[PDB]
Scaffold this active site. Sequence first.
Site, PDB file in Angstrom:
ATOM      1  N   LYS A 102       0.935  -0.749   0.234  1.00 60.27           N
ATOM      2  CA  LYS A 102      -0.164   0.291   0.123  1.00 60.27           C
ATOM      3  C   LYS A 102       0.622   1.246  -0.153  1.00 60.27           C
ATOM      4  O   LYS A 102       2.264   1.179   0.313  1.00 60.27           O
ATOM      5  CB  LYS A 102      -0.613   0.106   1.348  1.00 60.27           C
ATOM      6  CG  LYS A 102      -2.231   1.065   1.062  1.00 60.27           C
ATOM      7  CD  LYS A 102      -3.419   0.725   0.664  1.00 60.27           C
ATOM      8  CE  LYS A 102      -4.618   0.914  -0.158  1.00 60.27           C
ATOM      9  NZ  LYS A 102      -5.393   0.267  -0.713  1.00 60.27           N
ATOM     10  N   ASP A 142      -6.200   4.735  -6.093  1.00 56.49           N
ATOM     11  CA  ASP A 142      -6.843   4.028  -4.394  1.00 56.49           C
ATOM     12  C   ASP A 142      -8.029   5.483  -4.440  1.00 56.49           C
ATOM     13  O   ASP A 142      -7.931   6.146  -5.273  1.00 56.49           O
ATOM     14  CB  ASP A 142      -6.424   3.612  -3.133  1.00 56.49           C
ATOM     15  CG  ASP A 142      -6.997   2.930  -2.140  1.00 56.49           C
ATOM     16  OD1 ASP A 142      -7.837   3.898  -1.623  1.00 56.49           O
ATOM     17  OD2 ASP A 142      -7.361   1.930  -2.206  1.00 56.49           O
TER      18      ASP A 142
END
Lengths: 416, 416, 415, 415
Positions: A102, A142
Amino acid sequence: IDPFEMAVKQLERAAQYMDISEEALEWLKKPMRIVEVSVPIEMDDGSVKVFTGFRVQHNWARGPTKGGIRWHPAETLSTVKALATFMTWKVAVVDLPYGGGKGGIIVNPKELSEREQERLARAYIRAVYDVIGPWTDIPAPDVYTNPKIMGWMMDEYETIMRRKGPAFGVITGKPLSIGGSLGRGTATAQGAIFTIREAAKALGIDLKGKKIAVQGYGNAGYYTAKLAKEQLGMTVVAVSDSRGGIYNPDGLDPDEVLKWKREHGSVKDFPGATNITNEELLELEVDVLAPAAIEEVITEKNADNIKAKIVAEVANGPVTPEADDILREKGILQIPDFLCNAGGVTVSYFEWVQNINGYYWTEEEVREKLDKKMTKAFWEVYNTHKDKNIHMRDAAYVVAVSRVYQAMKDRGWVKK
Amino acid sequence: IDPFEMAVKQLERAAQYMDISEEALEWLKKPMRIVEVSVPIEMDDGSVKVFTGFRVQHNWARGPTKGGIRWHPAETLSTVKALATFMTWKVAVVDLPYGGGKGGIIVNPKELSEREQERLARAYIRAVYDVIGPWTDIPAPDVYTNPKIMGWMMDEYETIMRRKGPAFGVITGKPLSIGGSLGRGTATAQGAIFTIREAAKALGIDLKGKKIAVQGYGNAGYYTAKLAKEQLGMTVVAVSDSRGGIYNPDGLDPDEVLKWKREHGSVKDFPGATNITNEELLELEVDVLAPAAIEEVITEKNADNIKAKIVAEVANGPVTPEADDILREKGILQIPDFLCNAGGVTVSYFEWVQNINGYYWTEEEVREKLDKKMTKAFWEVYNTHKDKNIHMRDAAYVVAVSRVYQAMKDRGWVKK
Amino acid sequence: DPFEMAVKQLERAAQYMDISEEALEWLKKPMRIVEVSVPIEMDDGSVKVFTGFRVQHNWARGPTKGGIRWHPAETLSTVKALATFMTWKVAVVDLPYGGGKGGIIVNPKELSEREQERLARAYIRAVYDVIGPWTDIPAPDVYTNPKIMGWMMDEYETIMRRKGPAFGVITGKPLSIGGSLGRGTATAQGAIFTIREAAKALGIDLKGKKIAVQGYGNAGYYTAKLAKEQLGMTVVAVSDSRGGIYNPDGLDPDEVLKWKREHGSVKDFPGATNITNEELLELEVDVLAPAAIEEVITEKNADNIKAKIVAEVANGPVTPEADDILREKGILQIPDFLCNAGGVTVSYFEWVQNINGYYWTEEEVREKLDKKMTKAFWEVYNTHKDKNIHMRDAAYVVAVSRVYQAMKDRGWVKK
Amino acid sequence: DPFEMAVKQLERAAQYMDISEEALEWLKKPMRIVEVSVPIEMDDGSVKVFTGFRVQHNWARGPTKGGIRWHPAETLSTVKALATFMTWKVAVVDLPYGGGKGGIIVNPKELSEREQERLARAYIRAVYDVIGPWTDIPAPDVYTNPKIMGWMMDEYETIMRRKGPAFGVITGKPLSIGGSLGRGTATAQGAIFTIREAAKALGIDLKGKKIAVQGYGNAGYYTAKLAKEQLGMTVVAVSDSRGGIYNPDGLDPDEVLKWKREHGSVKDFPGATNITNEELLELEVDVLAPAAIEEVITEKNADNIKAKIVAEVANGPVTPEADDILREKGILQIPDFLCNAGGVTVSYFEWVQNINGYYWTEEEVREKLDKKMTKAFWEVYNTHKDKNIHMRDAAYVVAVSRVYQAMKDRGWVKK
Ligand code: NA
């Protein structure tokens, strides 16, 4: 810190349902690599500003790390570590040859011009280049990133890498012109629809003519409602956004509601429907409730009022650990978030496969492969939950963590 | 993040005495690259344990980042960030073609066997390989690391790199058999002696027959005392360790005191000496006081009792910001820590030069080049303090930050 | 045409040595030529694509060396010619280099600082795969300076990920990021050492003798200044493009530079007489140093030159017709690519400091430059005496001999 | 001038679509151009330096793809044109590639086999730094073939040290070392799929209908044989440079090839009557396939064409004046770079097999070629209907649009 400590606690709680060595558990509780970087840009006005960027690689035992880049003013390292940890379980529950990662930047992108956003996207790649790659770590969109930013990031990567390898494969969510995949836009909703079809089959429910409510009406909520109506033959009786819900017991047309929300900013006041609160939408008597907006909407306080037979966790963590026990005591089947929403990363895996193989698939090939994968993952998690007499969420950890642990043992990372 | 916030504050304070854009100051306040990694080892009993490692590269405008690796159970990221920031100033004040870095592992090395320490050294290198190298970032010893550990780390780096470049150059403080430099063991003390020699010239003092007290009797304090006596012809009237000091107005021999400490465990009760406290040592009437033990020993509480004409900051940070103003008002000349103790990184720069050039220097060559560098850096700082009428510590920042800022401007990282 | 001229001069000097025809045919062709799109986004948001070039003419002796020109009239033919000359210039001073050159077709006067930086970085992104500290090492040239070199070094280090001595990719850098002391005066200071050695070869003591300098750019100013300060000469004339000035008693180069800064020309300098460039060239002096433009000494005026030493500080100031005439008259020329080789010699020293991670004093650079330019001078001079040929042809013999020998020792050419 | 013609066709294309000026200017300039010395030692011991080119026009869509030409007339201008053209050809069939092209100025008929191998290996050594399986993938072209591709792959692998899928650096390889099935018939077989889809667009069943093919090399022979065997067509005429033959009941393509192998020409085939090339072009047939030479259909003869479909198997057999006339007659042309895209499509398949270490059957290559050519035909045809423009202009629109989109998606051009 706090999102990270909750992720570690969810892992510690599920670990009671499996045989895992303390050495393996301790390894899984710590992201293997964390990078925090200065991301400098020149603003339009000529001033240089340094933003804070993060990339976290939680675990690469099963393959390269995979996960998106969040651009948000509230962004913390704790949140990026939490979500990299969850990515490890998500890629493992759908049996992808990946680990979890991430990234993020602490920025308000609404205050940046298109030019500054491009300069930030490029500067991020130049800051994290040494730890990313098509066989190392593969980012994706995202919150407040998208295919446009992924295109800039890919381009910068290819420039530094000097076109030596499958540079298209460094990042997913790409525009179709430059190695993107068909099925990206609906991937999360489409996979959730397959999990909902399979949960209904497991409960002996025909969804044809049954009712769904969807909390949230961004891309995921809109496509969940559209696809449940078009593919599963359901009646969408309620949707909502941050400004309220709407209800119509004979059905909403999801495209007409989206048109309404684009004209006026919210689904609120849609003609023919009643305005309802988010809380009343969660309490409706429906075959499927799909929380597709925000975390922690079903908690200790309201778990007893949910009447849905299937709660499809489309959003990340919309159901708290105390609510898990109550919904299960009432006989309500949850599809845990990292199974239910794994369509997104599954189609991004297909994109990466297309990129490293230099060969592109049709919309129908992407759809049938997504269907087989989400169907097999649902049945492994449901069968584990039945065979061990545990909550679907614990079963999901058991399926996922088992694969990650097995890879760590077979590499000799942990001796037991 | 208290050590790091203090280092940022010291920069902000010194920034008032120079012309530096906001954009440049904001960049200098943020380390460009921070890595936190899992460093796993297999213990002698066969269990796997994961330690936390760090490597910080504060700024590489002037060249590859340079700084040591500290193994300590207290280690925090804040401390590593602070010391990497200090290294950027240290390498710039002595005009080295380097930036600042630092690393650490959170570990208690007393609890590790030799075999465990070697596994940890090799695991650290495997975890940070992608951000180090002879032209990228060159570590070194620090607290509870040493040439034995540098040798294992160099060996592991050469194994991964496949001998393609000057792998000896990846790390300094090496054993002599594998690319180490003569002058390593005495470099910090020898440099400090040169700064003391030049500070005495600036004040019109002949140090021959004058008094020095040294606080601390680690390698740096012992060699400061030994070289003050042998090279400058001073009388060492007092030394101390963590337990206590000793005093003799007719002089202590540093080699005798070191043998006493090896034989009996501390300097205490050295024959013919008077036992004194650490505070009493700081208060002695001497020409040179050299704090070479810990930080914050000269504070607002005791600064008024210092009688020394020269305070040689051998340790990193023994004088607080409130003490700086008191000592300067009393007419006491401080040689600020990152100038006074920059002998260590200067000889590590010479070691790296010898490694990348495949050519080794004599004792006398290292010593003559160290003398010229420390002498020139002392004169730049002293003349800046006189010409701008500022504290020696603010003058060290002006000399150092000026060079780094100029490098950042010349690369185009900041426009003004 | 500029490329055809470079080839002609090689063919010409070839007659003065035995070089196989296979080696000569190889030397006439640049080994590598790149032409690239160099795209930038303008301050106003529009994307423009510029034309860039890099030429590596020959790398037998070592990595290729030479600058980048930003000029609206740039041609490939010009970049190819100067790459060819570059190979001879690095060989005459015995550097472990071959010859290269690059450029972009741009008018930089029309670009913002921000646009110039974008262009410098885009050029490196476009030629990255053929440049490097051991491959091809650029430098400033026309409308190129240490500022632009800084931006280019930085972009290269960013692409290369700090894996090697990225400082060594490019010379003429600022001192803060691997520049060398001696850069600013290198051409002038080198010229001065060749003038000093030419005076020794002619049995002249230059102490109190006269020099004129055409041009009062960086090279002309420092040639005048150092001829006065180091050689002991009287500077009786200097010129820029808007004319010259004369004083038989001496000009102070610092006072003239100051005058020229206030007024934009050396003209009307107090205590001295305005003269034309042509009258400067014709003065009775021990040393004439043209350092302004090419082809200022032609068939048309070579017979009117009275200097005992013509120090070719600028490139190509003297034509081949003029060479025969000056030589007939017993005037010793210091040929351009020997006389002005100080520039590339100190750029070499800069590259050495960068690859060795160790920097030299002003005195170390001066002393190494002295020895290299002195040795290069005696080789060219001694060749011109021994083979009885023009200094220019002896410079090509020294240079081409070294390049040929390296091509033979590698087996590129059999004979 | 070849290059200026390629620029003019791009400028023409821009009139049928919305394309920004900055994008159009980008597409008019090859991004990279390399010109290199390619030295070989002759069998006689002498070293000769040849002139080689590699041009990478645009890599927005993926690595550059295209052939290497060995020809004594080769110019940089031609290699630039053909590279620019190659960008459109890979885009019309939706390949993840950009366009490139290379060449050597050489007469290959004068070189021994040993010299041709030295030349092939020397070329790869000179262009190594700008080629690779993810960078730029050559192929055969004029007077280069699978034998030369073999040598060139081998030299690339030797330099690369077997670190990657080196087979994928170049296509048209021999089958033993990563070649593909389907290579020899790819052009004809792709043309057959476009003829089948053109017939469907027109509502014609080709079974029992007539084809004429001009030319009887590999492409003309296989077009005749595959039209007959797969489409069920009657081949009533074929020709070569010496003349044509006609038989309204049909020719057996293999009997005619055996006659041409024995006599040099299809002319005087005993099972037919002789016709001229012009008579062949004017026959009343469903399909005419010009498969030989450029500009055979012109303003002079276009009004005499009777074919319902003109399948341009050769490159440029129809002039722009003729395009307008056939279009007014309602004749459907399959433009050359769509019709003959089977070659570059099967070369993409070869590269896919190389990078995936997995080789396909003849039937797998054919089915994937069918899907690709079918899809490309429908896009070009739908564009030509939807925008009411000539098939050739629609092919340019589909192609340029794709490249433009990749350039916008990368941020190369802001609009
Ligand atoms: Na979706």
